[PDB]
Amino acid sequence: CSLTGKWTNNLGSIMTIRAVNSRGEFTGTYLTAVADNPGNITLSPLLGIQHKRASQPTFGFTVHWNFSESTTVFTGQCFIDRNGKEVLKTMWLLRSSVNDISYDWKATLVGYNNFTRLS
Amino acid sequence: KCSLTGKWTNNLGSIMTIRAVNSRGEFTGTYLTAVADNPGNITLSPLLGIQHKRASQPTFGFTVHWNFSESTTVFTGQCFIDRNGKEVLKTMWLLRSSVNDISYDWKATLVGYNNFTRLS
Amino acid sequence: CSLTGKWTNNLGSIMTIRAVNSRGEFTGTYLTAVADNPGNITLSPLLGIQHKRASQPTFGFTVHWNFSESTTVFTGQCFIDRNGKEVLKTMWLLRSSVNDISYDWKATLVGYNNFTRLS
Amino acid sequence: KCSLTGKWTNNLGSIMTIRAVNSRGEFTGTYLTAVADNPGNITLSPLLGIQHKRASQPTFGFTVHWNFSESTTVFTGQCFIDRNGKEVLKTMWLLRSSVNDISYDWKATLVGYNNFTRLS
């Protein structure tokens, strides 16, 4: 299971991950299907690390949203079924920008996403 | 303005060191956790992340690839500057463990918080 | 959308929720399909509250696991599609018992579950 | 032994009052949050939960039905007793907002922590 390639998730978002280096580091581009103001969505860079030796590696990455002050992180594992089909099972945290520390409590959304490979 | 560059400790005693933040907001560093399932196996581990650049109190995220387990942690949060200029990173994290197959996926993700302040 | 009735989720767990009172309070019984030691699973009580007036209410409940020292909480919303079909979209936290406060960091798992009505 | 019965404050200044814990571990109470989207609309809200009974440091969960919004929060955690007999509730929470339809479900769930100690 390697992260390199093109992926879609259960919300219809897509991402492309470039080559994974010897340290497990990767870059890519994320197009979310969902946002607070969807008319404002632009492509956003991602940067992460996976484990290299594991056949079904865990990984994490950060998405710097280019159209808001927020940041999302994803972590999960790449699984391979008996037919060679890959799925990324992930959970995420979406951090919004708040004015000061007294508003921190309302700043972090949580959710899930399941990704499959595009063709 | 808040740059993540420098050394930080959190409420559990962990230390991380963040190198220069580039013009995209990308940064690398190391993380020495104070806690693990077997603290005797802990080793210094690499991190990689992105912060926002223009904001004075940026949000950010980073990934820690634990060098002593098959797990990965991601942190996200915001750097706040108080009226005296003191910086605090308020973060939440997800710690992903490796499981043997997808039937075990449900039990693989721990959640928590950490507050960081500067070492020095 | 009312919580009363019999439900299954995407992991194959089932639950039955009894009548919801005027305050939105409900009891029920939860059979998980998954656990650390699945051979030990027994039926476990749940207790929660939903909003009453809303057609698509938010709600929460606690499951006291009768076979371990852990507790799970679920929160989510009941949605009705155009055909009258209900789904509970939930997120959960599973709290394990740890020995003392220094282990608190490793005690809380997070996940999701989608529930649909049994027949 | 740790019973949730009594009054507690958390790190945000919120107060809750938990009534008698029954033989099943069930409890009701009230919660006065210090924080909300519009603090001027906050009202005292009911909670309902379950703790473990046999354990000296029980895990527990409860639901708060906010009486001034369409949201619901759930808390789960553990009551710890330290070597001097002081009790702390360590909790994590999920705050579910009401959204108009399932397409908005992704943005409906906030996560956080709270630490509680006794009022008195």
Swiss-Prot record, chains A, C:
Segments forming domain Avidin-like: 1-119
Chain residues that bind biotin: N9, S13, Y30, T32, D36, S68, N113
Glycosylated residues, chain numbering: N40, N66, N114
Cystine connections: C1-C78
Record localization: Secreted
Entry superkingdom: Eukaryota
One MF annotation (Gene Ontology) recorded for this entry: biotin binding
Cellular component, GO annotation: extracellular region
Keywords of this entry: Biotin, Disulfide bond, Glycoprotein, Secreted, Signal
Additional notes on this entry: The sequences of the coding regions of genes AVR4 and AVR5 are identical.
Function: Forms a strong non-covalent specific complex with biotin.
Family stated for the protein in its record: Belongs to the avidin/streptavidin family.
Subunit comment: Homotetramer.
Descriptive protein name: Avidin-related protein 4/5
Native source species: Gallus gallus (Chicken)
Gene: AVR4
